[PDB]
């Protein structure tokens, strides 16, 4: 349960380091810092305005940006579901 929470934090950093590098120069408001990126990657992870607000505008410059976001969305959604079930196990 704690192993999952640690793994996510690790993944989230590598993701926000990568996103900064890839989209930072072109999209400074969302990916211009490691911190600006950590926030957007959290916003995308909760799914709030992920596509119409972030992904679609990013793709008008980087047409393959979906290769980054869609997996990140699937990965974090699986990690969160795995973390959600881990709490249920601790009960039973």
């Amino acid at each position: 349960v704690g192993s999952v929470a640690a793994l996510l934090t690790v993944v989230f950093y590598i993701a926000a380091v990568m996103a900064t590098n890839l989209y930072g120069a072109t999209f400074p408001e969302w990916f211009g810092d490691l911190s600006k990126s950590l926030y957007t990657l959290f916003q995308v992870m909760t799914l709030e305005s992920w596509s119409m607000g972030i992904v679609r505008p990013v793709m008008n410059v980087h047409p393959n940006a979906w290769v980054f976001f869609i997996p990140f969305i699937m990965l974090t959604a699986f990690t969160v579901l795995n973390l959600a079930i881990g709490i249920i196990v601790d009960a039973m």
Copy 2:
């Protein structure tokens, strides 16, 4: 568990093939080719701007478009919940 993941992929393709055909000519940005559709159907599946952003604009041209989207939303939401429970079973 793997059977569900395979079934969804099958359904998602038939859905994106259909969506391309039905709304492609009229809504090229979201359903203009097979991939454009696959992305929009994923966006609709995560629920991000599904109605105000996609479905409502599509219905101003195709007033019965809801017969396609609403079931797709219910189907994928059930398939995902079924896939979510399948992972819980593998634990126990």
Copy 3:
């Protein structure tokens, strides 16, 4: 499990009959028919643009509209969670 699915359909109709009556004349695009209402109440139920898109604009005319929507959101979210768990029970 089937009892819950039946109860929701009943509730959804009474809700969409009520919403039509209350907000129909003032908000014809979202609540001007029983069908227009069934769609908005589904969109609100999935949570897509529920507040910034629907509830907040409705409250600029009907300032107590939240007494209708917030409970409907809580009720349907509980009914859906109850329906979600009912499927898990059928497995075990």
Copy 4:
């Protein structure tokens, strides 16, 4: 199960009292009084337009506003998941 529902209500009030104080004067439409805040904190809790619609505009004035919202989002999401599992326990 009832203990969780009580705890959330307590937390939600302290959060809405705080939000009113912190962002009230600057953002009167969303945090202008205790109720305006209670509604916005519920809207943020369901995740509807939490970032692009609320948090990002608030940060253009209060750049550390994320220290309030992101934890509130994580806290309520955990409290709700804990409340969701509590209902499953009552079945079994």
